[PDB]
Symmetry: D2
Subunit: 198 residues, 4 copies
């Protein structure tokens, strides 16, 4: 059984960068929808699985990738932002970003171009490639999860579905991305990094 | 070479159903963007094609499908709404629908479910299957147009991208749907029906 | 637990149209691979499901659609051909084909164009659309099943992966399709039809 | 406008590794087909483009990606084999591979697994990531070319479509793979390495 995680800050804690109204609808409407449908779908699936019914298992796959992915991605998302975040990573995480993108700024330009560039709904991700020992940016469509579709471990992700910025920045998806770099909980992406290194 | 069509009604005209601020953004910002990037892609494709560069041509296909399909689809969408819209179609279109669906209500139910059901960004479409001579409800992702990708002739489309409803309906995509029926310009839909029995 | 079905005729029973060597490799090498990997994958999945692990369930989806689909499709395939088949359907099935494609011959041209037309590996299908009460041809990529991806009930399908004709017809995929119409067990596609009508 | 390149060796030359009958079919029938349908599509696209017909352009994209990518990919493939092939690369390419993979053996293992692992028709590719300056193993489906779809520069490709091995290896795609190492023309691969550090 899956549950909606509690938000770790209040809904208006990230104003002026992302405001309360967006935070509230994102969490308790959208994310709530995903874990409920995830729970329904996993249940239908199990029953299909027991009957040995392969047509049903395959029929169910799009709902399980959409709702399972939504739940995963929004859950990493909420911990990736903090009332008290922004600035630059430190330690090993920042030297991996220098090692792989040249510098933090060339890292920002590249994750801003990938997120801005998604055609339709999607997410931009900073991920860890454990097969190669290095950081990598990937973009994903719809709610498709970074690890399950790609194999990379998600460290920082940015929602660019229009429900994530539209009441506030309207169509200006670059203004949302300039705003977002101000609330990034670098302390959490460092920890995400650190568990791969384990 | 491609021009943003003029909306055939003032922005404020489909109130209270679709509000004036969505109509201005959707037309002047969302559709205007598609036309302009389509123009730039067609031109680059022309050069790529001139030179026999198959890599460049393959690399420009997403851009050309996204923006060209975006321009097709919003232009049909604007002719599908009217201040004088709503109600029911009469004559040969209503007969067509009744054979194919049973009742306008079943039709309406089947296309609302096809619209509300899209995952991520996309469109639901009432189309005509020329080979079979029959009406068909398709759904397309992102901006992929009906004819170019399915071969169905576009009769009626309803955009369900979040930018089409969010400022007014927020996440309640069914409330948007129920309201859009009130401005559907059945005159234009039947012209299109008339034209592929042409 | 899934098992390789027994072939209902000997491996050379369909010469000269499809020969023994192809039949043997298709059944006991290729189809055998699919049900074994289906059995491994369903098992991994169940265990992922129990742990509530969504990333693993999604990771497993391509192997479950590929191997589950392979098993389904090849299993319908073997019953679709007979040493003693060919000719034309009778009864209701033939009047549905007249009703939907105009005639049996216009039915053959259309399922031959769809199978010939698949780009890469795939299958052409004659299917039943239970939502609309009519027959429909669909083409599918790789081993994606007709009912699980599309919702149509499979009645007659044609494998056009190259392992299905290459040792015999080489690249001339039209020669394989002319040959195949001679071994089609129409008595079985009638029965498949009849269970939808139930 | 596009021409089938002449094979740089006689058909019989990669015996016993790849036999003479596969080399004749693959070149004169499989690749010759791609070139010719590419020519016909480029021309129709030209007309579609001349007229500002975005539907026609979108409808011709599969054909143009299938056939153009098919022509790209087989042409690089023929320069990748040699009668005088096999063994190991030496010099700067072998250094590159060793940094990126560890040993030629790990490289060979990782690309064989990426090749044997494709589902359906496709290709495995050793590529260069220009932005990162590093070697990458990609796999592509059907005929989608590396650069046009991933941006990686194509260094070494191995076709794993069934027509590339079936007449000689039947379903044992690993035996094909193990043998193809014996004709890889590492001279041509390194020219390509040399050229995007150009
Ligand atoms: Mn979201
Ligand atoms: Mn729109
Ligand atoms: Mn097969
Ligand atoms: Mn080939």
């Amino acid at each position: 059984k899956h549950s909606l995680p509690d938000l770790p800050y209040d809904y208006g804690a990230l104003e002026p960068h992302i405001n309360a109204q967006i935070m509230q609808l994102h969490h308790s409407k959208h994310h709530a929808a995903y874990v409920n449908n995830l729970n329904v779908t996993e249940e239908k699936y199990q029953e299909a699985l027991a009957k040995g019914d392969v047509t049903a298992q395959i029929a169910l796959q799009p709902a399980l990738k959409f709702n399972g992915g939504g739940h995963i991605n929004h859950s990493i998302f909420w911990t990736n932002l903090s009332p008290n975040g922004g600035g630059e990573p430190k330690g090993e995480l920042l030297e991996a970003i220098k090692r792989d993108f040249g510098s933090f700024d060339k890292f920002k330009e590249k994750l801003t171009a990938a997120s801005v560039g998604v055609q339709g709904s999607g997410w931009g991700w900073l991920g860890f490639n454990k097969e190669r020992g290095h950081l990598q940016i990937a973009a994903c469509p719809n709610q498709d999860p970074l690890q399950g579709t790609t194999g990379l471990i998600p460290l920082l992700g940015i929602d660019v579905w229009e429900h994530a910025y539209y009441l506030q920045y309207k169509n200006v998806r670059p203004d949302y991305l300039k705003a977002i770099w101000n609330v990034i909980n670098w302390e959490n992406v460092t920890e995400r990094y650190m568990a791969c290194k384990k």
